[PDB]
Amino acid sequence: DQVSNLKDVVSTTKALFEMSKETAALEAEAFELKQKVAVASEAKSVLDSWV
Amino acid sequence: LDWTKIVSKLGLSGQTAAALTSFKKRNDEAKRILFELKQQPSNVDFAFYKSTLKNTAIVDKIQSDVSKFTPSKANLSKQLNLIESFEAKALENAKETESVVLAELTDLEKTLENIESXXXXXXXXXXXXXXXXXXXXXXXXXXXX
Numbered sequence A: 001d002q003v004s005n006l007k008d009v010v011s012t013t014k015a016l017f018e019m020s021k022e023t024a025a026l027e028a029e030a031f032e033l034k035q036k037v038a039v040a041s042e043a044k045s046v047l048d049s050w051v
Numbered sequence B: 001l002d003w004t005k006i007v008s009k010l011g012l013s014g015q016t017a018a019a020l021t022s023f024k025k026r027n028d029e030a031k032r033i034l035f036e037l038k039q040q041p042s043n044v045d046f047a048f049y050k051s052t053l054k055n056t057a058i059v060d061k062i063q064s065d066v067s068k069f070t071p072s073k074a075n076l077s078k079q080l081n082l083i084e085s086f087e088a089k090a091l092e093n094a095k096e097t098e099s100v101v102l103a104e105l106t107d108l109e110k111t112l113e114n115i116e117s118x119x120x121x122x123x124x125x126x127x128x129x130x131x132x133x134x135x136x137x138x139x140x141x142x143x144x145x
Helices: A002-050 B014-036 B059-066 B081-115 B124-142
Strands: none
Touching: A002 B014, A002 B059, A002 B081, B081 B124
């Protein structure tokens, strides 16, 4: 049980840095995609109303 | 990549159930947001918007500013809160477990050979190893309670 917990603690402590790094990188990709989709929807709505 | 080993990576205490459930829910929702959204920039159909607009030079000026650059809700890697905590956790939980696993494996290997070996020549030596093995049982129960 002590040998199994020693190998598991090394994987659990190393996963704390990768969990926050994946969420922080995904927040910038989701915000950039939502901002680009909002500008495309606002330009398409003005083009459809003018046409 | 482990639901099988990620949920059982904690100890006997149930205090890590709230922290493991929050990290698994945020990781699943982050991958679904990038897959459902489009991986392209913007269409900007300016070929049919400039000739259909009422005001002159209206759709041409808005298409050039939207295709350049804008602002987004992003951040940098300066606030590395989990990066500093991951290195400190390895020195108190992972590095400390190495010395405990080395002392438990050395005491168990010496107690197995002394219990099977006679009663005058290799006995007094087996009695000393039996005292350490008996104290190891009490230390194992104190580490779990």
